[PDB]
Amino acid sequence: PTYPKYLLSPETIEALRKPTFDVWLWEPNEMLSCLEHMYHDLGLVRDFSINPVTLRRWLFCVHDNYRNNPFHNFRHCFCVAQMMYSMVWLCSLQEKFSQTDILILMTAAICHDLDHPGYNNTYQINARTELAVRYNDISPLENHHCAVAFQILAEPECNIFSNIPPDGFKQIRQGMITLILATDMARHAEIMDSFKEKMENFDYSNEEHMTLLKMILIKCCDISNEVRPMEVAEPWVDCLLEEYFMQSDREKSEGLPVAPFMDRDKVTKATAQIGFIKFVLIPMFETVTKLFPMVEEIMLQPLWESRDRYEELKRIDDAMKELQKK
Amino acid sequence: KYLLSPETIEALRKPTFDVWLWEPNEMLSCLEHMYHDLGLVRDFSINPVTLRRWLFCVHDNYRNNPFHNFRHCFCVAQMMYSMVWLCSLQEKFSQTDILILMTAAICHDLDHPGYNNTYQINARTELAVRYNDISPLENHHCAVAFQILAEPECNIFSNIPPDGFKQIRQGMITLILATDMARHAEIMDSFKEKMENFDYSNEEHMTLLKMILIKCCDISNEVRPMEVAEPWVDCLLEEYFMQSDREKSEGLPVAPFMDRDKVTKATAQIGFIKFVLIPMFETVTKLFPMVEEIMLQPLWESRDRYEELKRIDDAMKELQKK
Ligand SMILES: C[C@H](Nc1nc2c(cnn2C2CCCC2)c(=O)[nH]1)c1ccc(Cl)cc1
Ligand SMILES: C[C@H](Nc1nc2c(cnn2C2CCCC2)c(=O)[nH]1)c1ccc(Cl)cc1
Ligand SMILES: [Mg+2]
Ligand SMILES: [Mg+2]
Ligand SMILES: [Zn+2]
Ligand SMILES: [Zn+2]
């Protein structure tokens, strides 16, 4: 017969390994089975004795604790984890990383934005929210994401780590914390600098070198929308702006400082992306490409195409503006 | 009784102050006096009644642990006060820096549960989860401090412009977080590096001096006269033994240094005085030479007395082993 949607066709299983995967085609259950497959496929179920039913329940519980924000939602969480999965195969990460490290990368990726409220750290801090007060202005959102993740894992029925010895739990916990806290974009430049410092003489057996590489990998996945095919990447920009304009409107309304790059009166889809692609995304992937040359063809190539395309779109937007006064 | 005598006011400036004489209300008045006396009420337009309410609210949020209680909070604040005079800190620090120092000292152990970070993390408590194993207690004390200040009746900063608030908040966070002893060696290394060529106009140098200053006050019990210092040790052990009992009882790791079967009053202090307190105050003394005689002196005397007490403990134990 034809099988229900939550049983994945072998074609889907093959495509899920690539960054070309159309993340929009699927509904929550399907995305959940994809994530489930990822954990069996990467050998994590086997190597950490994860009860398969607990795995399913953990995923449903993770899903429940993402909110319906325009951008920072379950689908984002899915993109980040799916990109991480793609890079595991693209860069043959199982040759460089222990299975515990793969578990840290994957789990951190899935958990990195739990219960995101849809307003960034600058808002939390400027408006003196309960979160800012609780975290003393220190990466409040990312601390919260990480706490929710471990609240979830402390419910015994959601605890995928239940059969891991306490030495492994401690190593995994600290790994996930580092990685989730590393996604706070306030720290982008710091982390990139530390990473570039090690890249002068990179050493795969050096634990500090690897920690940074993992921090860079999760960061790559977190903001990797523009790496994806044009058709898959574009709607994410509408989602981004919808969520961010919601914040700046509120900042205006409550008399809080407003950042030009998020002002709904000043921003186009093009100006949102160009600078970000040229000066944040491209340099980051260029550096990763030095360790993993195969990344150039698969991830810098589409970033270049997207830069050029949005640069052209701006020339056109500007010419059109000029024309209404010229 | 309610009102402080001029002798009390005078004694409050010195580290000889007998912290045990006073009950909570009289300690609150002493803390009140410090804020007026330092010019903080004047220079920040603190509403005088809000100041009293704030202190009462702070008081309400300290717990009745044997050691980490409102009286410890008083000792730290009062030792800070003493150092402002001893080291003439109003010449070197802005009034904002003094306010940060005093307010952080008062707030630095708010709502302490009586079991340290190692317990929080190993037991996987609510606080360790909330703060991801990163100085959970000290983040929590800080959080509580600003929840208190968000209540408008307790807000001693209500007449400070936003920018000043932000600066005070940042300073307070750094100092309360610096009290975590897991960071002792890191902070000492950083400070000793700056003492290679210290600069009162470098903000990073001043930030570390304040971190060192609050640390000094936090752990300063042994600097006080013996009659005042000794009872704090019983409190210390009472509280730390309560933890280690619970740790044995729950299958969690127990540290020899706080094991009720292994620890005498003397073995608790000798190492701490010799390797934590003396070297820290030695470094501070290089900036403030008057510290040597007022604070390193009672420390040397304390070290020597506990070393004697240990020799006599070891002798009475030779009358026991079977
Ligand atoms: C500069 C930034 N552009 C951008 N930001 C992105 C992307 C993905 N994640 N992020 C940000 C959301 C948190 C990690 C940075 C992306 O593809 N583009 C931006 C421009 C305009 C607005 Cl309205 C919002 C963000
Ligand atoms: C080594 C430590 N000694 C010690 N620790 C002290 C003192 C003051 N504060 N503290 C600690 C309380 C947390 C900031 C350090 C003190 O006077 N002595 C200690 C030994 C045995 C037990 Cl049971 C507890 C503590
Ligand atoms: Mg995030
Ligand atoms: Mg403390
Ligand atoms: Zn994200
Ligand atoms: Zn303390």
XYZ file of C-alpha atoms and ligand atoms in Angstrom:
702
model
C 0.000 0.000 0.000
C 0.921 3.656 0.619
C 2.259 4.060 4.188
C 1.396 6.851 6.692
C 3.423 10.076 6.578
C 5.500 9.386 9.733
C 7.171 6.359 8.087
C 9.909 7.882 5.973
C 10.404 6.762 2.383
C 13.976 5.673 1.529
C 14.197 8.797 -0.713
C 13.508 11.086 2.240
C 16.166 9.192 4.271
C 18.669 9.773 1.471
C 17.803 13.496 1.088
C 17.891 14.163 4.863
C 21.699 13.738 4.724
C 22.081 16.744 2.416
C 21.746 20.523 3.068
C 19.408 20.704 0.035
C 16.611 19.105 2.100
C 13.325 21.046 1.803
C 12.468 21.673 5.418
C 9.093 23.226 4.458
C 7.588 19.985 3.042
C 7.056 18.440 6.475
C 4.781 18.758 9.459
C 5.799 18.342 13.092
C 5.384 14.520 13.298
C 7.378 14.029 10.112
C 10.179 16.314 11.321
C 10.119 14.392 14.608
C 10.565 11.048 12.839
C 13.413 12.616 10.878
C 15.100 13.624 14.107
C 14.408 10.155 15.508
C 16.017 8.562 12.446
C 19.062 10.799 12.891
C 19.745 9.332 16.340
C 19.466 5.683 15.199
C 21.431 6.400 12.022
C 24.355 8.122 13.748
C 24.695 5.124 16.091
C 23.787 7.142 19.208
C 20.846 4.927 20.186
C 23.190 1.962 20.021
C 26.259 3.533 21.626
C 24.436 5.202 24.534
C 21.729 2.564 25.074
C 18.957 5.072 24.489
C 15.526 3.542 25.055
C 13.852 4.123 21.633
C 10.521 5.028 23.253
C 12.179 7.562 25.565
C 13.810 9.003 22.437
C 10.378 9.543 20.861
C 8.925 11.015 24.035
C 11.921 13.342 24.553
C 11.444 14.644 21.009
C 7.728 15.260 21.549
C 8.500 17.025 24.817
C 11.164 19.156 23.096
C 8.667 20.069 20.409
C 6.109 21.074 23.104
C 8.573 23.519 24.670
C 9.187 25.427 21.451
C 6.825 28.369 20.920
C 4.946 29.576 17.831
C 7.183 32.533 17.067
C 7.532 33.558 13.427
C 11.256 32.626 13.354
C 12.417 30.960 16.577
C 10.127 27.936 16.433
C 10.270 24.175 16.159
C 11.028 24.299 12.429
C 14.150 26.441 13.117
C 15.212 23.903 15.704
C 14.728 21.306 12.988
C 16.808 23.259 10.436
C 19.686 23.612 12.830
C 19.738 19.894 13.730
C 19.278 18.825 10.127
C 22.161 21.043 9.038
C 24.271 19.545 11.821
C 23.376 16.084 10.500
C 24.294 17.237 6.960
C 27.679 18.459 8.131
C 28.392 15.228 9.977
C 28.236 13.456 6.589
C 29.662 16.240 4.413
C 32.725 16.701 6.672
C 32.985 13.041 7.837
C 32.819 14.244 11.403
C 32.672 10.675 12.775
C 36.337 10.312 11.756
C 37.358 13.329 13.925
C 34.883 13.263 16.805
C 33.974 10.751 19.491
C 30.390 9.526 19.573
C 29.904 11.538 22.759
C 30.866 14.681 20.808
C 28.357 13.864 18.023
C 25.712 13.433 20.715
C 26.671 16.793 22.197
C 26.482 18.501 18.794
C 23.151 16.963 17.849
C 21.425 17.306 21.175
C 22.698 20.862 21.638
C 21.417 21.703 18.161
C 17.924 20.414 18.899
C 17.795 22.142 22.290
C 19.577 25.425 21.563
C 16.445 27.680 21.349
C 13.979 26.035 23.776
C 11.163 28.302 24.954
C 12.512 31.306 23.067
C 10.065 34.165 23.797
C 10.554 35.915 20.424
C 12.446 38.926 21.779
C 16.249 38.970 21.828
C 18.714 39.508 24.708
C 18.888 43.243 24.085
C 15.162 43.462 24.732
C 15.369 41.251 27.841
C 18.085 43.470 29.243
C 16.718 46.871 28.237
C 13.190 46.091 29.451
C 14.583 44.415 32.604
C 12.553 41.234 32.150
C 12.336 38.429 34.691
C 14.910 36.562 32.548
C 17.439 39.410 32.545
C 17.060 39.727 36.302
C 17.368 35.982 36.763
C 20.507 35.753 34.622
C 22.063 39.077 35.637
C 22.255 40.335 32.038
C 24.567 37.426 31.112
C 23.212 35.739 27.947
C 19.751 35.442 29.495
C 17.978 33.679 26.591
C 20.735 31.115 26.022
C 21.039 30.327 29.729
C 17.252 29.766 29.741
C 17.364 27.536 26.650
C 19.941 25.408 28.332
C 18.038 25.208 31.624
C 14.793 24.160 29.954
C 16.769 21.483 28.061
C 18.007 19.949 31.318
C 14.641 20.333 33.072
C 13.297 18.210 30.251
C 16.093 15.634 30.612
C 15.426 15.391 34.363
C 11.899 14.153 33.747
C 12.620 10.381 33.762
C 10.252 9.651 30.859
C 12.021 12.224 28.646
C 15.541 11.342 29.797
C 17.351 9.915 26.787
C 20.534 9.817 28.898
C 19.052 7.488 31.564
C 21.443 4.619 30.693
C 24.614 6.738 30.572
C 27.049 6.536 33.523
C 27.295 9.754 35.643
C 30.801 10.491 34.235
C 29.338 10.640 30.725
C 26.333 12.711 31.760
C 28.662 15.301 33.308
C 30.813 15.446 30.165
C 27.730 15.696 27.917
C 26.077 18.315 30.124
C 29.077 20.587 30.140
C 29.474 20.110 26.392
C 25.885 21.117 25.644
C 26.099 24.161 27.942
C 29.230 25.455 26.243
C 27.645 24.953 22.819
C 24.245 26.411 23.611
C 25.813 29.435 25.313
C 28.052 29.844 22.236
C 25.036 30.573 20.015
C 24.537 33.979 21.682
C 25.482 36.224 18.764
C 26.783 38.907 21.135
C 29.802 36.554 21.373
C 30.271 36.028 17.634
C 33.439 38.041 17.157
C 35.134 36.784 20.373
C 34.548 33.149 19.387
C 35.628 33.644 15.774
C 38.836 35.305 16.975
C 39.596 32.459 19.410
C 38.890 30.003 16.620
C 41.141 31.804 14.095
C 43.926 31.858 16.690
C 43.862 28.047 16.913
C 43.575 27.692 13.129
C 47.167 28.892 12.732
C 48.217 25.458 14.006
C 45.021 23.417 14.402
C 45.398 20.222 16.424
C 42.576 17.635 16.399
C 43.898 16.014 19.618
C 43.866 19.330 21.513
C 40.654 19.501 23.581
C 40.450 23.323 23.534
C 40.830 23.341 19.757
C 37.939 20.887 19.455
C 35.666 22.759 21.868
C 35.995 25.830 19.632
C 35.422 23.811 16.479
C 32.206 22.466 18.006
C 31.203 26.009 19.014
C 31.800 27.096 15.436
C 29.899 24.141 14.017
C 26.757 24.773 16.045
C 26.997 28.487 15.275
C 27.252 27.619 11.563
C 24.126 25.498 11.726
C 22.226 28.077 13.789
C 22.461 30.781 11.084
C 22.822 28.560 8.013
C 19.503 29.436 6.307
C 21.173 31.172 3.348
C 23.302 28.059 2.672
C 20.109 26.262 1.688
C 18.672 26.441 -1.844
C 17.120 29.796 -2.768
C 13.556 28.404 -2.693
C 14.067 26.952 0.815
C 15.958 29.976 2.198
C 13.715 32.892 1.108
C 10.599 32.258 3.281
C 12.896 32.184 6.335
C 13.710 35.838 5.683
C 10.005 36.751 5.912
C 9.867 34.833 9.189
C 12.946 36.615 10.470
C 11.614 40.071 9.677
C 8.139 39.285 10.954
C 9.585 38.289 14.369
C 12.137 41.105 14.554
C 9.681 43.834 13.439
C 7.377 42.606 16.219
C 10.196 43.423 18.684
C 11.092 46.891 17.350
C 7.396 47.913 17.246
C 7.194 46.985 20.917
C 10.434 48.822 21.739
C 8.967 51.943 20.070
C 5.705 51.450 21.938
C 7.414 51.060 25.379
C 9.995 53.824 24.711
C 13.015 51.506 24.567
C 16.024 51.912 22.265
C 15.451 50.728 18.693
C 18.183 49.291 16.485
C 18.157 50.559 12.862
C 18.773 47.079 11.427
C 15.430 45.883 12.864
C 13.290 48.978 12.230
C 10.306 48.028 10.038
C 10.377 51.507 8.365
C 14.047 51.117 7.288
C 14.666 47.462 6.395
C 14.228 45.560 3.126
C 14.670 41.834 2.589
C 17.891 42.751 0.757
C 19.507 45.046 3.355
C 18.665 42.465 6.046
C 20.799 39.859 4.279
C 23.659 41.403 2.288
C 25.926 42.577 5.106
C 25.085 39.506 7.171
C 26.040 37.174 4.321
C 29.203 38.999 3.245
C 30.632 39.743 6.671
C 29.214 37.151 9.063
C 28.330 34.008 7.074
C 30.995 33.943 4.354
C 34.022 34.554 6.667
C 32.794 31.900 9.101
C 32.384 29.232 6.404
C 35.686 30.237 4.724
C 37.474 29.436 7.997
C 35.686 26.102 8.355
C 36.595 25.287 4.721
C 40.306 25.334 5.665
C 39.663 22.228 7.770
C 36.957 20.838 5.490
C 37.624 21.866 1.839
C 34.476 20.043 0.632
C 32.455 22.831 2.362
C 33.413 25.351 -0.346
C 31.451 23.599 -3.083
C 28.455 22.689 -0.890
C 28.078 25.758 1.367
C 30.118 28.736 0.164
C 28.850 28.337 -3.395
C 25.175 28.974 -2.448
C 26.218 31.775 -0.075
C 27.981 33.503 -2.976
C 24.943 33.047 -5.227
C 22.697 34.465 -2.483
C 25.010 37.444 -1.884
C 25.045 38.314 -5.619
C 21.316 37.837 -5.933
C 20.471 40.083 -2.963
C 23.044 42.650 -4.081
C 21.305 42.793 -7.480
C 17.920 42.980 -5.756
C 19.163 46.047 -3.850
C 20.405 47.810 -7.015
C 16.874 47.314 -8.351
C 15.181 48.434 -5.079
C 17.389 51.593 -5.069
C 16.795 52.379 -8.737
C 13.071 52.028 -8.116
C 13.275 54.418 -5.144
C 15.332 56.937 -7.068
C 12.711 56.800 -9.850
C 9.965 58.031 -7.469
C 11.502 61.554 -7.185
C 14.102 61.473 -10.040
C 18.487 50.370 72.968
C 16.894 51.191 69.627
C 19.433 54.014 69.071
C 23.170 53.647 68.639
C 25.459 55.327 71.178
C 28.348 57.561 69.960
C 30.800 54.898 71.210
C 29.088 52.297 69.017
C 29.216 54.718 66.042
C 32.935 55.213 66.739
C 33.680 51.475 67.092
C 31.829 50.630 63.871
C 34.736 52.108 61.867
C 37.220 49.500 63.123
C 37.627 45.723 62.465
C 37.688 45.236 66.256
C 33.909 45.750 66.301
C 32.093 43.072 68.333
C 29.506 41.823 65.878
C 27.908 39.501 68.469
C 26.640 42.178 70.873
C 23.904 43.295 68.520
C 20.543 41.865 67.585
C 19.095 42.313 64.095
C 17.501 45.797 64.578
C 20.727 47.298 65.916
C 22.676 45.818 62.995
C 20.167 47.365 60.602
C 20.730 50.782 62.230
C 24.477 50.290 61.912
C 24.107 49.548 58.198
C 21.830 52.538 57.899
C 24.411 54.729 59.597
C 27.095 53.553 57.155
C 25.104 54.766 54.159
C 24.517 58.225 55.695
C 28.090 58.430 57.058
C 29.731 57.595 53.692
C 27.746 60.305 51.880
C 25.798 57.775 49.786
C 22.396 59.044 50.942
C 23.461 62.561 50.138
C 25.198 61.860 46.817
C 22.509 59.491 45.377
C 19.380 61.089 46.885
C 18.452 57.858 48.594
C 15.128 58.421 50.286
C 16.025 57.861 53.993
C 12.897 55.767 54.673
C 13.383 53.672 51.549
C 16.888 52.948 52.916
C 15.388 51.573 56.142
C 12.756 49.576 54.263
C 15.365 48.189 51.893
C 17.541 46.993 54.764
C 14.549 45.314 56.401
C 13.684 43.628 53.098
C 17.275 42.471 52.659
C 17.089 41.114 56.207
C 13.880 39.213 55.484
C 15.614 37.462 52.554
C 18.608 36.103 54.475
C 17.981 32.664 55.981
C 18.695 31.219 59.433
C 21.637 29.092 58.421
C 24.307 28.691 61.101
C 26.948 30.563 59.053
C 25.444 32.091 55.893
C 22.964 34.371 57.627
C 22.126 38.009 58.142
C 24.918 38.391 60.702
C 27.510 37.179 58.135
C 26.122 39.783 55.777
C 26.663 42.364 58.501
C 30.260 41.226 59.098
C 31.107 41.617 55.452
C 29.481 45.038 55.105
C 31.052 46.229 58.363
C 34.501 45.005 57.350
C 34.100 46.860 54.023
C 33.147 49.983 55.988
C 36.281 49.475 58.109
C 38.453 49.230 55.038
C 37.047 52.393 53.534
C 38.482 54.221 56.568
C 41.614 52.167 57.140
C 42.680 52.339 53.488
C 41.173 55.824 52.863
C 39.236 54.518 49.888
C 37.273 57.754 49.283
C 40.493 59.252 47.852
C 40.867 56.449 45.289
C 37.273 55.480 44.447
C 34.320 57.435 43.166
C 31.208 57.495 45.290
C 29.612 55.140 42.767
C 32.394 52.633 43.383
C 31.816 52.891 47.160
C 28.089 52.340 46.703
C 28.817 49.274 44.594
C 31.209 47.971 47.230
C 28.829 48.484 50.147
C 25.646 47.323 48.447
C 27.292 44.238 46.962
C 28.701 43.390 50.394
C 25.255 43.584 51.960
C 23.614 41.584 49.175
C 26.292 39.035 48.311
C 24.766 35.991 50.109
C 21.029 36.741 49.779
C 18.765 33.686 50.196
C 21.706 31.298 50.679
C 20.326 27.756 51.257
C 23.193 26.482 53.442
C 24.691 24.018 50.939
C 27.419 25.278 48.587
C 27.860 25.061 44.790
C 29.494 21.622 44.862
C 26.317 20.326 46.539
C 24.084 22.226 44.087
C 25.874 20.722 41.078
C 26.445 17.153 42.328
C 22.867 16.873 43.637
C 21.589 18.418 40.358
C 19.393 20.885 42.230
C 16.915 23.408 40.868
C 19.543 26.163 41.141
C 22.303 24.203 39.428
C 19.912 23.460 36.578
C 18.730 27.074 36.377
C 22.283 28.465 36.182
C 23.833 25.570 34.193
C 26.471 24.780 36.862
C 27.938 28.302 36.512
C 28.335 29.844 40.003
C 24.699 28.965 40.759
C 24.558 30.361 44.294
C 26.256 33.615 43.419
C 24.042 34.205 40.369
C 21.037 33.528 42.623
C 22.129 35.968 45.345
C 22.527 38.582 42.665
C 19.149 37.886 41.089
C 17.500 38.142 44.485
C 19.313 41.423 45.133
C 17.748 42.990 42.031
C 14.305 41.486 42.560
C 14.432 43.310 45.888
C 15.478 46.571 44.204
C 12.691 46.239 41.626
C 10.132 46.560 44.437
C 9.611 50.367 44.414
C 9.337 50.677 48.215
C 12.727 48.945 48.608
C 14.415 50.775 45.718
C 17.254 52.805 47.179
C 18.327 53.597 43.591
C 14.972 55.117 42.537
C 16.493 58.620 42.152
C 19.536 57.561 40.171
C 19.471 58.223 36.414
C 19.184 55.070 34.209
C 22.867 55.198 33.154
C 24.031 55.271 36.761
C 21.732 52.384 37.571
C 23.195 50.366 34.713
C 26.729 51.101 35.916
C 25.884 50.184 39.523
C 24.117 47.005 38.409
C 27.074 45.878 36.286
C 29.502 46.605 39.122
C 27.389 44.763 41.679
C 27.086 41.729 39.414
C 30.825 41.485 38.908
C 31.511 41.687 42.662
C 28.858 39.254 43.890
C 29.927 36.762 41.213
C 33.560 37.280 42.265
C 32.819 35.881 45.761
C 32.618 32.318 44.351
C 35.766 30.709 45.825
C 36.114 28.346 42.855
C 37.485 31.481 41.125
C 39.893 32.425 43.963
C 43.143 31.499 42.187
C 42.029 32.989 38.828
C 41.208 36.324 40.466
C 44.393 36.345 42.532
C 46.516 35.609 39.450
C 44.770 38.425 37.558
C 45.269 40.872 40.405
C 48.940 39.972 41.015
C 49.602 40.516 37.304
C 48.212 44.070 37.585
C 50.210 44.654 40.795
C 53.339 44.251 38.663
C 52.538 47.867 37.661
C 49.292 49.077 39.267
C 47.332 52.005 37.824
C 44.494 53.657 39.788
C 43.165 55.145 36.517
C 42.883 51.820 34.648
C 39.266 50.591 35.008
C 40.236 46.899 34.671
C 42.745 47.457 37.494
C 40.050 49.033 39.672
C 37.529 46.322 38.856
C 39.998 43.705 40.127
C 40.858 45.728 43.229
C 37.140 45.838 44.117
C 36.778 42.117 43.448
C 39.718 41.545 45.793
C 38.281 43.980 48.303
C 34.912 42.214 48.598
C 36.595 38.825 48.695
C 38.707 40.085 51.613
C 35.632 41.159 53.517
C 33.679 37.978 52.717
C 36.242 35.658 54.338
C 37.610 38.149 56.894
C 36.361 36.574 60.121
C 39.842 35.606 61.374
C 41.108 39.209 61.057
C 38.834 40.160 63.980
C 39.859 39.676 67.655
C 39.926 36.035 68.844
C 36.873 36.408 71.091
C 34.906 37.632 68.032
C 36.439 35.231 65.485
C 36.230 31.913 67.395
C 32.426 31.563 67.486
C 32.258 31.978 63.662
C 34.256 28.771 63.344
C 31.593 26.777 65.257
C 28.960 28.256 62.962
C 31.090 27.392 59.946
C 31.471 23.733 60.905
C 27.849 23.382 62.057
C 26.731 24.412 58.560
C 29.347 22.570 56.527
C 28.879 19.343 58.566
C 25.123 19.555 57.967
C 25.975 19.404 54.232
C 28.510 16.587 54.383
C 26.114 14.480 56.519
C 23.489 14.903 53.811
C 26.108 14.084 51.156
C 27.080 10.788 52.919
C 23.377 10.066 53.307
C 22.553 10.622 49.591
C 25.596 8.865 48.077
C 27.173 12.091 46.802
C 30.891 12.799 46.952
C 32.121 14.207 50.274
C 35.196 16.384 50.589
C 37.664 15.413 53.336
C 38.128 19.116 54.290
C 34.496 19.306 55.564
C 34.012 15.710 56.790
C 32.585 15.679 60.339
C 34.824 12.695 61.286
C 38.079 14.269 60.076
C 37.909 17.978 60.904
C 38.886 19.887 64.045
C 38.472 23.649 64.499
C 42.261 23.894 64.066
C 42.659 21.873 60.807
C 39.787 23.925 59.336
C 41.669 27.247 59.792
C 45.421 26.660 59.620
C 45.557 25.999 55.866
C 42.918 28.575 55.061
C 44.717 31.266 57.034
C 48.132 30.349 55.656
C 47.360 29.829 51.968
C 44.182 31.843 51.301
C 43.972 34.713 53.794
C 47.568 35.700 54.471
C 48.701 35.776 50.830
C 45.578 37.721 49.830
C 46.033 40.408 52.472
C 49.821 40.441 51.725
C 49.055 41.505 48.164
C 46.541 44.124 49.324
C 49.107 45.478 51.806
C 51.417 46.436 48.906
C 48.788 49.011 47.894
C 47.812 49.842 51.461
C 50.724 49.311 53.908
C 48.568 50.228 56.938
C 46.728 46.938 56.357
C 49.739 44.946 57.564
C 49.511 46.035 61.172
C 45.691 46.092 61.445
C 44.885 42.873 59.547
C 47.938 40.688 58.845
C 48.851 40.960 62.535
C 45.731 39.270 63.972
C 46.063 36.696 61.165
C 49.623 35.784 62.198
C 48.516 35.508 65.829
C 45.524 33.349 64.791
C 47.682 31.012 62.665
C 50.063 30.539 65.594
C 47.273 29.865 68.099
C 45.567 27.272 65.867
C 48.927 25.566 65.230
C 49.362 25.302 69.027
C 45.794 24.036 69.421
C 46.500 21.399 66.764
C 49.578 20.118 68.637
C 47.459 19.768 71.775
C 44.613 18.113 69.808
C 47.109 15.594 68.353
C 48.359 14.844 71.898
C 44.868 14.139 73.369
C 44.230 11.838 70.340
C 47.307 9.785 71.328
C 45.356 8.877 74.493
C 42.580 7.288 72.280
C 43.593 5.255 69.173
C 43.200 1.522 69.798
C 21.416 41.077 10.162
C 20.263 40.085 10.409
N 20.144 39.123 9.300
C 20.019 37.820 9.522
N 20.009 37.362 10.769
C 19.899 36.046 10.998
C 19.787 35.137 10.009
C 19.698 33.941 10.601
N 19.755 34.138 11.923
N 19.885 35.408 12.158
C 19.959 36.201 13.434
C 18.924 35.655 14.449
C 19.797 35.240 15.597
C 21.153 34.891 14.991
C 21.296 36.131 14.133
C 19.791 35.527 8.721
O 19.695 34.728 7.775
N 19.908 36.900 8.462
C 19.011 40.705 10.496
C 18.629 41.684 9.587
C 17.376 42.278 9.674
C 16.483 41.882 10.660
Cl 14.910 42.622 10.767
C 16.853 40.892 11.568
C 18.109 40.308 11.479
C 38.848 25.542 54.605
C 37.560 26.155 55.185
N 37.922 27.157 56.205
C 37.340 28.344 56.268
N 36.460 28.739 55.344
C 35.875 29.949 55.414
C 36.146 30.797 56.413
C 35.407 31.892 56.186
N 34.707 31.699 55.068
N 34.994 30.540 54.601
C 34.443 29.845 53.402
C 32.901 30.005 53.369
C 32.704 30.092 51.889
C 33.776 31.096 51.445
C 34.954 30.388 52.093
C 37.023 30.451 57.381
O 37.300 31.198 58.324
N 37.643 29.205 57.319
C 36.730 25.213 55.802
C 37.244 24.146 56.541
C 36.393 23.232 57.163
C 35.020 23.385 57.065
Cl 33.973 22.255 57.845
C 34.496 24.454 56.339
C 35.347 25.363 55.714
Mg 19.239 31.430 19.988
Mg 28.670 33.376 49.110
Zn 18.776 29.611 16.831
Zn 29.769 35.278 52.113
